Amino acid sequence: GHHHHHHEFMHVFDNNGIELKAECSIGEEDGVYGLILESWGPGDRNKDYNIALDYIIERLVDSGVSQVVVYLASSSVRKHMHSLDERKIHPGEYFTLIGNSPRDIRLKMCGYQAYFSRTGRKEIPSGNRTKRILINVPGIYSDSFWASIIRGELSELSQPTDDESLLNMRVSKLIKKTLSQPEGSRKPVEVERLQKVYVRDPMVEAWILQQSKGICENCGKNAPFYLNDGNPYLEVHHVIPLSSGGADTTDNCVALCPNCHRELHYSKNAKELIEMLYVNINRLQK
Amino acid sequence: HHHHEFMHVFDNNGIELKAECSIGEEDGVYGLILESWGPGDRNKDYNIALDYIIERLVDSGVSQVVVYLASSSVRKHMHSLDERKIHPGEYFTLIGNSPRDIRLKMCGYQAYFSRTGRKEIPSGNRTKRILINVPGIYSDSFWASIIRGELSELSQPTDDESLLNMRVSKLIKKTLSQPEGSRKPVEVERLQKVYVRDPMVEAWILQQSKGICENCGKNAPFYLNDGNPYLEVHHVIPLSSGGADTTDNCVALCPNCHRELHYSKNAKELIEMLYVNINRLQK
Numbered sequence: 252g253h254h255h256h257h258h259e260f261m262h263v264f265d266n267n268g269i270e271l272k273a274e275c276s277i278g279e280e281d282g283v284y285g286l287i288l289e290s291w292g293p294g295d296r297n298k299d300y301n302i303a304l305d306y307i308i309e310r311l312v313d314s315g316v317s318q319v320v321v322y323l324a325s326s327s328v329r330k331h332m333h334s335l336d337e338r339k340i341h342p343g344e345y346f347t348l349i350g351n352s353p354r355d356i357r358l359k360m361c362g363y364q365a366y367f368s369r370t371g372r373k374e375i376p377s378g379n380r381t382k383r384i385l386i387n388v389p390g391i392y393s394d395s396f397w398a399s400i401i402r403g404e405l406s407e408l409s410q411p412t413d414d415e416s417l418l419n420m421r422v423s424k425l426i427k428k429t430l431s432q433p434e435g436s437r438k439p440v441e442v443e444r445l446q447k448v449y450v451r452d453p454m455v456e457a458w459i460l461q462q463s464k465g466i467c468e469n470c471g472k473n474a475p476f477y478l479n480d481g482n483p484y485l486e487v488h489h490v491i492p493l494s495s496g497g498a499d500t501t502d503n504c505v506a507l508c509p510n511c512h513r514e515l516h517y518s519k520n521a522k523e524l525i526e527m528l529y530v531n532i533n534r535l536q537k
Numbered sequence: 538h539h540h541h542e543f544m545h546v547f548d549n550n551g552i553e554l555k556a557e558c559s560i561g562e563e564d565g566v567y568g569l570i571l572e573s574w575g576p577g578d579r580n581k582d583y584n585i586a587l588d589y590i591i592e593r594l595v596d597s598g599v600s601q602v603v604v605y606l607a608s609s610s611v612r613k614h615m616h617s618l619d620e621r622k623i624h625p626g627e628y629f630t631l632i633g634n635s636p637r638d639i640r641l642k643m644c645g646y647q648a649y650f651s652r653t654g655r656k657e658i659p660s661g662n663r664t665k666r667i668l669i670n671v672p673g674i675y676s677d678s679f680w681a682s683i684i685r686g687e688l689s690e691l692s693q694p695t696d697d698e699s700l701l702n703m704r705v706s707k708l709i710k711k712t713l714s715q716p717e718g719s720r721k722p723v724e725v726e727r728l729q730k731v732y733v734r735d736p737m738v739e740a741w742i743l744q745q746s747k748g749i750c751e752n753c754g755k756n757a758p759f760y761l762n763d764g765n766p767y768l769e770v771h772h773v774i775p776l777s778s779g780g781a782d783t784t785d786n787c788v789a790l791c792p793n794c795h796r797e798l799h800y801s802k803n804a805k806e807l808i809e810m811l812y813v814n815i816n817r818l819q820k
């Protein structure tokens with residue numbers, strides 16, 4: 252319901268539950284979804300930008316978010332830069348929050364905004380450091396997650412949930428802590444849900460599997476196991492995902508073993524392997 | 538006002554036969570229009586292609602057809618459909634020991650016609666342009682399945698991942714020309730039934746594995762960002778089947794081993810070996 256009703260801006264709450272002068276919103280823009288922090292304006296409109304950003308980073312880390320992706324989201328940048336790889340403010344595919352304190356992470360984040368102008372990228376970080384920005388956590392499409400980050404009341408890490416992205420996020424943090432044997436649920440709670448899924452083409456899948464000849468196209472190795480019908484098991488992967496508006500065509504699909512298909516989603520060196528395949532496989536067109 | 542979807546008849550393995558046809562409507566009659574075995578070996582394997590058609594028609598419930606001559610000479614010189622009908626009786630029935638012997642009956646009737654009209658002595662061609670009509674049926678997708686076999690049904694796109702797998706599995710057997718596909722696929726909001734899952738259970742299981750799988754020995758395929766070893770937790774008795782979300786019903790596996798327990802037929806035996814090796818598990 253984003254039509255006929257002028258959406259009002261949400262404001263980030265401090266640790267005492269009190270509203271900050273720091274406009275924000277939760278939404279999707281140009282294929283990417285997350286928290287859109289509004290810019291520090293002329294005449295001190297969003298005076299608490301920096302301190303509000305400190306709290307967001309703080310709360311993401313305590314909720315188990317290790318890595319994020321921050322995009323430049325002022326109206327000019329989105330016009331003059333059409334790709335997602337270029338609108339991102341930081342080098343590498345994922346900005347990590349693990350290393351340092353929330354202020355240090357923020358200073359750096361605010362710093363990388365200065366390397367942008369309205370035409371494009373600058374030689375030096377001379378620009379403004381308090382622009383409109385979009386913070387993406389990969390895998391997370393939940394409005395309630397971002398709502399809690401703005402609100403300041405977070406869920407406990409042990410909290411059960413139906414969201415599998417939210418589960419993984421919490422586990423990734425729980426692995427670092429010493430866990431005693433948890434009791435669990437002998438009768439787990441089922442829940443009806445809606446999910447968005449794309450209609451896929453069996454011919455594009457089937458064509459890509461035949462051409463592979465049952466060998467993974469990233470690593471050189473052959474398929475791990477065989478199906479009941481006798482065929483080898485690989486998994487077809489869209490190099491430009493369908494969530495990010497990619498095509499369902501043979502010229503951006505690739506057959507991989509389960510392990511490599513996982514590598515390309517989550518690995519620390521995932522940017523190397525995705526470019527590597529655009530050289531090797533000549534049908535793959537970016 | 539005639540419409541046509543042009544095709545070649547396919548065999549059971551998806552190979553394009555030398556037997557061009559169409560799903561068309563001509564003079565009110567809608568059906569499969571199989572082109573002639575030509576003057577210079579045009580449509581070489583007409584008779585082969587017609588056997589598949591007769592086989593598929595019988596497989597899909599059709600026992601009766603009407604066959605008209607549809608050559609442009611006959612069209613001109615024979616002025617009613619009733620005289621263009623090759624067989625006596627309202628229908629030609631698809632019954633016999635073989636589709637081939639049925640085809641010989643059907644083509645036997647064709648010999649009783651010249652290019653200009655009906656022939657007193659059957660001394661004519663047995664391999665002519667004909668329209669195979671099934672009155673009552675007006676589906677292109679029905680005739681597409683008669684023309685292309687099971688390959689036309691299996692090629693249909695879907696959101697259902699289980700059905701997408703059944704179809705893909707069967708399409709790997711067939712020979713396939715290049716698909717093209719869609720450059721802007723449609724997203725569907727569909728209903729789903731998921732379970733509320735405990736992250737203490739999952740995180741405990743991943744800790745006690747120490748980065749190695751519980752059916753193959755190997756380490757994690759890659760180290761996840763922030764240095765974690767990448768494995769996947771899987772419920773040995775599914776939550777669908779009344780499985781508990783407990784440490785005694787979970788195992789850590791690499792993606793290869795995870796898919797192996799799901800999609801193999803030999804998975805039902807792999808499960809048994811987890812109860813032997815991993816003595817934590819209860820059932």
Ligand SMILES: [Zn+2]
Nearest residue numbers: 487488489512
């Ligand atoms: Zn994929």
Ligand SMILES: [Zn+2]
Nearest residue numbers: 467470508511
């Ligand atoms: Zn591989």
Ligand SMILES: [Zn+2]
Nearest residue numbers: 770771772795
């Ligand atoms: Zn599983």
Ligand SMILES: [Zn+2]
Nearest residue numbers: 750753791794
């Ligand atoms: Zn394994």
